[model samples]
Target chain A: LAEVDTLARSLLLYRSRLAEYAHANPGFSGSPADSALGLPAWFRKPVRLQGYIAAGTSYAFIASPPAGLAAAVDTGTESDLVGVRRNGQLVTRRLGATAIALPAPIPEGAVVAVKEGHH
Target chain B: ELAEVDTLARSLLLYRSRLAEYAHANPGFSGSPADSALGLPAWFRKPVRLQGYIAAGTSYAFIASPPAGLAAAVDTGTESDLVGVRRNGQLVTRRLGATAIALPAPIPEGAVVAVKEGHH
Candidate 1:
């Protein structure tokens, strides 16, 4: 956590410098106002999700605890797939956001989720 | 969890913006922009609660370079510490805390320099 925090801080500082450079050299594209650099709006959102990490030997990313989480996936062709899952089990998956609520909350180990209540 | 991380990321981002503003307004000073705003010397370096940006266009480490033009250095013998200077729109850095007075390439005008003390 310390190393991660340090690295994150370093990155923040670099971004700051980039912003200064942009001010001095307007054409530099690395401007702090650029969406490509993930400025204001990106950080304005409450959730900055970096995803999950494992505590056990076998590491994996999972949406655990509260099961109200839903996601929309693209099928690479036409249309798209939308669904909700809890404990890796699909509760009321659909092709759209209509039936959005996820399944009941469950945790394999000592863990937690963002929102455990039914949506 | 994501929200917490996001909050931290946002705070850091905002901090970065403030640092950039400070660096822009005040040129040729080292250490935190906030601290430098007080008219402190570049060598008046001190540890920060959370690591911070010392300058724009330079990478940061955990070691401090001697005061500008001091011709003296401190060596911590840790390879993690670094010193970076931006020259001609390029960032040139080298490890410190083990080498003294061996500054990185000289910085050009309108450029920035940074030092990181490896411990924190």
Candidate 2:
């Protein structure tokens, strides 16, 4: 879609500004670039990823149609367990990356997860 | 998908880097870094990244501390059109066909907007 293209272009165009905002005074982003952010996925390939947290807001970040980066404002009160529907009853899920997970308090700010799919 | 979105994103990323090189090399407006590379100029205001909704599609909309005004809705109308909602650090632009200098969609108050008036 034209809209989708416009959105993607906008994201790439503003990557520098976003990084500057993150590292500037009154910091809002604490996302450390993962190994994938600089290293290649396939030994020979140069493809890597770049992700950013929206300052004081939430967004469904899309670097590409297949790459959906969702950043949530962790309220620090919700259960660490993600809900799931088995047969009918809902169950909590413990999930990660490198991949690893640990139950801890996520500060009030945008937290990003690199998910693979089309939104 | 007539073309690949992923592929284009990669190219755009690389292209932006190239543009940055030229954009900064001509900080004083010397045409040396601009003759072959007329990309975005440095030392400028974000005119294209407006942070207010369209007031009349004619020019100017009251922004935060730029002073707010009589708010408008999201539905299409006569006065307010060309709505833009800033998301993910970028200004997403959209307009009603009936206008630009006269867009047809009603722009919600305080939303980001930029007319497709194209290149002043």
Candidate 3:
């Protein structure tokens, strides 16, 4: 099962690369599925993730650590999303789009929720 | 449904491109079920660097024959609660967990298939 392990690991590596890109390019609105999350051509078959969150944030955390993706919180109100560091420093512009980077790296399984308000 | 389809389309394009890259890197490589089972060297070849992430409901489609030496199957642990393989555009089998599903007959090689993962 080395091949399976390799492919599975490759998926993780690809995901991490995208996550890193997202981290570097805070305002990345383009599709990561193309440039960063590119897969092998031999893997022509479609793939499904159990609780996959590619570029943006998820409502709640899941069992696995997001491979190449980040997390976000949705305020019921139309509030602006702001990325803040562990020290509460402002990171990126207000996240108006679905995809935006967080101020700091989120610790694994750490719940990060966004609030609706002005910084 | 439309959004799902769009996501799937993007994924397919990405996957296809990766496959193409792999082929280019390993010109002598011929796909085999044994290779598929172990995640072939072709997978680790350069040019087509592998992606390390897995998402839920992320289904992929590929054109190839049913199991040469290994059974055609997928791991449904990360994505959908259920995994279904469509052989040549027909629903052939569905399964859950790490177990691989063996396809039903008359499904020839090089048949196009869409491996679908369920919502829940």
Candidate 4:
């Protein structure tokens, strides 16, 4: 749980650096930001969610607690696809405004969808 | 197409450019340059949007969709731990409880390391 928060905050805080990387490394292409990344198709909407704090290094990303958690991780694009999933599932998914819900809430351990929960 | 393994790096780099542009466009912000924001040594080079976890407690991780704007925020102060995979099957690790330095994880300890090498 605590770890999950760190991961999310780390991503948000270093946002400026991340954007710079995207712009500078145009040719340094990687995979697509679709399902290939990790998330459902409906994750493109805007919503707010909550979940445990996972850990993420400059290189890798990881989350735990499996079920009852949701997230709206960045899809490398603004308002494209946000990642949401049940913690402990090791299955991170993407949600958006319509796909998920913004005011959505869940149990203490049960994660709630972030990034404008499904509309 | 991007895959589950691709999400970490893809997402991390996505914001790098956005923040860099923001810093460059907006001066007198009193913040570190997105690329050179950290007060690291001269050799400690920082890249735009280079993805890594919180080495200390309570740092900020930007989440930008379309790679811009404040998408979300998370609390990484308790313990910063994020990972990535390398093409050579080595995992790259960064965060607290370890050196605040940014480097690849040792073999076996980490699984999915996502890096292109040749970075300063």
Winner by TM-score: 1
Stretches of candidate 3 exceeding 4 Å from the true structure: A27-30, A33-119, B1-120
Better of 2 and 4 by TM-score: 4
TM-score of chain A of each: 0.24, 0.24, 0.29, 0.26
lDDT of 2 by residue, B1-120 (tens): 243433323332233333334434433332112223434336333231112111111111111121111111100011111123334333333221111122112222223332211100
lDDT of 4 by residue, A18-72 (tens): 3234444444433223223334354441122111111222232322322211132
| All candidates: interface RMSD | 26.3, 21.5, 21.8, 15.0
> lDDT values of the candidates?
0.26, 0.24, 0.27, 0.27
- Residue by residue across B42-62, what tens digits does model 1's lDDT show? 544434322344432221221
Candidate 1's residue-wise lDDT over A1-119, tens digit each? 12333333333344343333333443322113334444455344212211111110100111121121111100110111111223343121111112212223222111111111000
Worst 10 residues of 1 chain A by lDDT: A72-81
What lDDT does candidate 4 reach at residue A104? 20
Clashes of each: 9, 5, 49, 112
DockQ of each: 0.01, 0.02, 0.02, 0.04
Query: For model 2, which pairs clash?
Result: A97-A100, B81-B105, B99-B102, B99-B103, B100-B103
Off by over 4 Å in 4: A1-3, A14-16, A30-60, A63-119, B1-120
Question: Interface RMSD value for candidate 1, one decimal?
Answer: 26.3
TM values, all candidates: 0.21, 0.17, 0.19, 0.20
In angstroms, the error of model 4 at B51 is 37
